[PDB]
Design an enzyme around this catalytic site. Structure first.
Site, PDB file in Angstrom:
ATOM      1  N   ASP A   1      36.058  38.307  24.867  1.00  0.00           N
ATOM      2  CA  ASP A   1      36.467  38.155  26.277  1.00  0.00           C
ATOM      3  C   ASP A   1      35.385  38.656  27.224  1.00  0.00           C
ATOM      4  O   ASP A   1      35.624  39.492  28.090  1.00  0.00           O
ATOM      5  CB  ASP A   1      37.818  38.836  26.561  1.00  0.00           C
ATOM      6  CG  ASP A   1      38.422  38.428  27.918  1.00  0.00           C
ATOM      7  OD1 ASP A   1      38.054  37.359  28.456  1.00  0.00           O
ATOM      8  OD2 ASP A   1      39.256  39.183  28.457  1.00  0.00           O
TER       9      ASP A   1
ATOM     10  N   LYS B   1      33.464  38.330  30.257  1.00  0.00           N
ATOM     11  CA  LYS B   1      33.621  37.753  31.593  1.00  0.00           C
ATOM     12  C   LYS B   1      33.143  38.814  32.598  1.00  0.00           C
ATOM     13  O   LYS B   1      33.129  39.996  32.274  1.00  0.00           O
ATOM     14  CB  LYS B   1      35.088  37.296  31.851  1.00  0.00           C
ATOM     15  CG  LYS B   1      36.167  38.367  31.716  1.00  0.00           C
ATOM     16  CD  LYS B   1      37.580  37.823  31.906  1.00  0.00           C
ATOM     17  CE  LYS B   1      38.596  38.940  32.127  1.00  0.00           C
ATOM     18  NZ  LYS B   1      39.961  38.589  31.640  1.00  0.00           N
TER      19      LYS B   1
ATOM     20  N   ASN C   1      34.865  42.165  33.216  1.00  0.00           N
ATOM     21  CA  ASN C   1      34.619  43.197  32.200  1.00  0.00           C
ATOM     22  C   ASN C   1      33.215  43.793  32.211  1.00  0.00           C
ATOM     23  O   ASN C   1      32.801  44.462  31.264  1.00  0.00           O
ATOM     24  CB  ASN C   1      34.932  42.601  30.827  1.00  0.00           C
ATOM     25  CG  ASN C   1      36.376  42.139  30.721  1.00  0.00           C
ATOM     26  OD1 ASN C   1      37.251  42.595  31.470  1.00  0.00           O
ATOM     27  ND2 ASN C   1      36.642  41.261  29.772  1.00  0.00           N
TER      28      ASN C   1
ATOM     29  N   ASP D   1      36.745  47.526  29.506  1.00  0.00           N
ATOM     30  CA  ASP D   1      37.862  46.720  28.977  1.00  0.00           C
ATOM     31  C   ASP D   1      37.507  46.084  27.630  1.00  0.00           C
ATOM     32  O   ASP D   1      37.050  44.945  27.563  1.00  0.00           O
ATOM     33  CB  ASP D   1      38.368  45.664  29.960  1.00  0.00           C
ATOM     34  CG  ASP D   1      39.636  44.952  29.460  1.00  0.00           C
ATOM     35  OD1 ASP D   1      40.253  45.398  28.458  1.00  0.00           O
ATOM     36  OD2 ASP D   1      40.020  43.933  30.076  1.00  0.00           O
TER      37      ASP D   1
ATOM     38  N   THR E   1      41.204  34.290  29.464  1.00  0.00           N
ATOM     39  CA  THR E   1      41.204  33.353  30.624  1.00  0.00           C
ATOM     40  C   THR E   1      40.177  32.245  30.328  1.00  0.00           C
ATOM     41  O   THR E   1      39.086  32.578  29.877  1.00  0.00           O
ATOM     42  CB  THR E   1      40.797  34.038  31.945  1.00  0.00           C
ATOM     43  OG1 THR E   1      39.524  34.686  31.787  1.00  0.00           O
ATOM     44  CG2 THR E   1      41.876  35.049  32.401  1.00  0.00           C
TER      45      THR E   1
HETATM   46  C1  LIG Z   1      45.957  45.742  29.384  1.00  0.00           C
HETATM   47  O1  LIG Z   1      46.182  46.841  30.267  1.00  0.00           O
HETATM   48  C2  LIG Z   1      45.268  47.169  31.219  1.00  0.00           C
HETATM   49  C3  LIG Z   1      45.518  48.237  32.072  1.00  0.00           C
HETATM   50  C4  LIG Z   1      44.576  48.583  33.023  1.00  0.00           C
HETATM   51  C5  LIG Z   1      43.400  47.860  33.157  1.00  0.00           C
HETATM   52  C6  LIG Z   1      43.171  46.806  32.330  1.00  0.00           C
HETATM   53  C7  LIG Z   1      41.950  45.959  32.416  1.00  0.00           C
HETATM   54  C8  LIG Z   1      42.374  44.713  33.199  1.00  0.00           C
HETATM   55  N1  LIG Z   1      40.811  46.604  33.062  1.00  0.00           N
HETATM   56  C9  LIG Z   1      40.146  47.611  32.450  1.00  0.00           C
HETATM   57  O2  LIG Z   1      40.533  47.999  31.357  1.00  0.00           O
HETATM   58  N2  LIG Z   1      39.068  48.187  33.025  1.00  0.00           N
HETATM   59  C10 LIG Z   1      38.333  49.273  32.382  1.00  0.00           C
HETATM   60  C11 LIG Z   1      38.285  50.409  33.405  1.00  0.00           C
HETATM   61  N3  LIG Z   1      37.378  49.942  34.457  1.00  0.00           N
HETATM   62  C12 LIG Z   1      36.722  50.900  35.240  1.00  0.00           C
HETATM   63  C13 LIG Z   1      36.838  51.031  36.648  1.00  0.00           C
HETATM   64  C14 LIG Z   1      36.096  52.006  37.306  1.00  0.00           C
HETATM   65  N4  LIG Z   1      35.276  52.797  36.640  1.00  0.00           N
HETATM   66  C15 LIG Z   1      35.143  52.703  35.327  1.00  0.00           C
HETATM   67  C16 LIG Z   1      35.836  51.764  34.601  1.00  0.00           C
HETATM   68  F1  LIG Z   1      35.661  51.698  33.269  1.00  0.00           F
HETATM   69  C17 LIG Z   1      38.026  48.878  35.220  1.00  0.00           C
HETATM   70  C18 LIG Z   1      38.484  47.751  34.308  1.00  0.00           C
HETATM   71  C19 LIG Z   1      44.082  46.464  31.363  1.00  0.00           C
END
Ligand SMILES: COc1cccc([C@@H](C)NC(=O)N2CCN(c3ccncc3F)CC2)c1
Ligand SMILES: COc1cccc([C@@H](C)NC(=O)N2CCN(c3ccncc3F)CC2)c1
Lengths: 377, 383
Positions: free
Chosen positions: B191, B193, B196, B209, B228
């Protein structure tokens, strides 16, 4: 921060319910309690077990187990199991191993006595108390590996010797100090009898079987207060001193002071001790000895050892040319056992002789009561 | 003997399922799963709980918990929870904290993805991967405390800049090295994208992610279809098993999206997109107004082929050696130590300006043992 240090310190501590061995018991128990076909229809349970299948095999193999010992002889049977003379295969070292049936303990609503027994033996750190080296468990049993007491018990001794007064003086004094140790640990024994008194390789006393011991705030040896209580009533350390009175009588006279054919007769005699206690006219016994016995065999209120042990220690019956109180155990015992080998069980009588938990339909937690038992010294 | 040393060594190891933190999770979970009035009618259960009531209070207090952090802003929402900008009360240090709902994960038969996600972030030990500092849990939630990436994601960047080729070259090369790291850990991302892909305080890439990541076999393949669709490869669409080359497809798409500004196989419907992706031999067309070099077009085309002949089937060297990547600014061994195209201008340690603004049910009280906490035993991790 300091919190991670605090938590680590709890886990380090061998007295902690969350030490490593306890935490492992937690895991093993959970796996034992959940690993049944019916329960695995629950996906949480099934996947958990799959995840932890390999690692729990590995652990069971590494951890101490009954298979690590060779059973030489059964040297005792008791209410909830047996005592085995064993040898640990690797070290070749000989131990006594006490087994307790989980099923029976649960079934017969008695599943907490072992905790104090374990702790007393693990931690007393005293030459009057038998040492526990290891405690461990299977799905069926609790095991306690203790040091083997090859001299046998006092019941044995009394049956194989007319005990002269000098001997009785020695053994009584050793019992006195042993009980004082127990009392110092904050415990009342509640079942002081010669069955629970054991002789080491050098013929010296150590106490064993702490299954009746209680933390403070067979009827022949029971005191009147304890008798009248069990219909409630409360009682103290003085009830053990009653039993020493009985013990000294049994040694010197050769029969129990309140012996009767029935148990009811004995209770009745004990209750009536003011009138029932009679030294037989043919009994070869000193005035001092009679004095001490009588001092112990009174009503709780006025009993010797109400004001602590000093008054017992200072009693003139105990005056002698052989030992003092501070060194008695380091002096020559009356009877040093002559033992032919490290597995010699000649001072233990022979013994002639199961059901497990049913496969449960739902979670029942039969292993939960024993989480924390495992101890490695 | 050596057995007690062997066993101790298992428990010492932070990768072990029987480390101290896991064993504690075991206990906490058991207490959480059993401590309900109906269950305490069982005397084994009641007496166990009584014995362990005090010590488990003590532990809950000492152990890390959500209360230890102040929530500043929600900076992300996802399928099974949210991402919070937080500050740890005592240290005053700022982190990004990802929350995952236990109830939802259980309810929606998806309760194992977090393990690899956790492990990747905990142990990757790589500047291309967002560092996990702590993982912990309540009865409701899994928490993952990570280093905060204040530069935001690449979706953000592309929406706020026409990306020139030099930039795209930089970001693509950083994505390439990042994916190579993931692949070296034995993982297929599945995934890739720009959602991420995240930018640190200095404007450099890190991946975040890892919820779709799968461990490869000993033969590099992996075994029902995630993503997606814009960035999904034809093999993953038609699947069926696939390998590390499916991520490289997505890089192709990414580079196209950066340089062109629309997705290569865009359609109004999803079915149209699938249809276009499947027909990529014919459907991929560079618009006549698109600012893009021959080398760039070459690379994209090298990625946007059938799995069998795709660039990065024979590993990363052939990608690294592609002439699109030739430049006066950086090499592969130092790219991340060079000046990023866009350094974020940040006013404070809680500046979330590169994150877009963002617009519940618990387990029922069970009548018998059900083990809702069992799936999460082992999650807790303290770096
Ligand atoms: C399936 O459940 C969930 C729940 C919550 C978030 C997500 C996914 C969509 N997004 C995610 O994992 N991330 C990593 C953390 N990310 C940072 C933001 C700032 N600073 C550091 C980060 F690592 C932002 C996106 C999925
Ligand atoms: C209620 O369940 C049980 C189960 C088994 C045994 C018992 C009682 C009857 N006796 C007992 O516990 N002991 C301790 C070990 N003793 C030693 C024997 C040699 N060496 C050292 C000992 F400690 C012998 C007496 C009760």
């Amino acid at each position: 921060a300091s919190r991670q240090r605090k938590l680590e310190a709890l886990i380090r501590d061998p007295r902690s319910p969350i030490n490593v061995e306890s935490l492992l018991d937690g895991l093993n128990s959970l796996v034992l309690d959940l690993d049944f076909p019916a329960l695995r229809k629950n996906k949480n349970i099934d996947n958990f077990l799959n995840r932890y299948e390999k690692i729990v095999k590995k652990i069971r193999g590494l951890q101490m187990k009954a298979e690590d010992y060779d059973v030489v002889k059964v040297i005792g049977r008791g209410a909830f199991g047996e005592v085995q003379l064993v040898r640990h295969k690797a070290s070749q070292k000989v131990y006594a191993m006490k087994l307790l049936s989980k099923f029976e303990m649960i079934k017969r609503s008695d599943s907490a006595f072992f905790w104090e027994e374990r702790d007393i033996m693990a931690f007393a750190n005293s030459p009057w108390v038998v040492q526990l080296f290891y405690a461990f468990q299977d799905d069926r049993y609790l095991y306690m590996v203790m040091e083997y007491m090859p001299g046998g018990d006092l019941v044995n001794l009394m049956s194989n010797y007319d005990v002269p007064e000098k001997w009785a003086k020695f053994y009584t004094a050793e019992v006195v100090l042993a009980l004082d140790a127990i009392h110092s640990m904050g415990l009342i024994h509640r079942d002081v009898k010669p069955d629970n008194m054991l002789l080491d390789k050098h013929g010296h006393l150590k106490l064993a079987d702490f299954g009746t011991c209680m933390k403070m705030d067979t009827p022949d040896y029971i005191s009147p207060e304890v008798l009248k209580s069990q219909g409630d009533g409360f009682y103290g350390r003085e009830c053990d001193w009653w039993s020493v009175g009985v013990f000294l009588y049994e040694m010197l006279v050769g029969d129990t002071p309140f012996y009767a054919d029935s148990l009811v007769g004995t209770y009745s005699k004990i209750m009536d001790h003011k009138n029932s206690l009679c030294f037989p006219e043919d009994a070869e016994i000193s005035k001092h000895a009679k004095n001490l016995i009588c001092a112990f065999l009174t009503d709780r209120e006025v009993r010797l050892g109400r004001n602590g042990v000093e008054e017992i220690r200072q009693h003139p019956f105990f005056k002698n040319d052989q030992w003092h109180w501070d060194n008695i155990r380091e002096t020559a015992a009356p009877v040093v056992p002559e033992l032919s080998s490290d597995i010699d069980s000649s001072n233990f009588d022979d013994i002639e002789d199961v059901e497990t938990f049913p496969i449960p339909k739902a979670f029942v937690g039969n292993q939960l009561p024993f989480i924390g038992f495992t101890y490695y010294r």
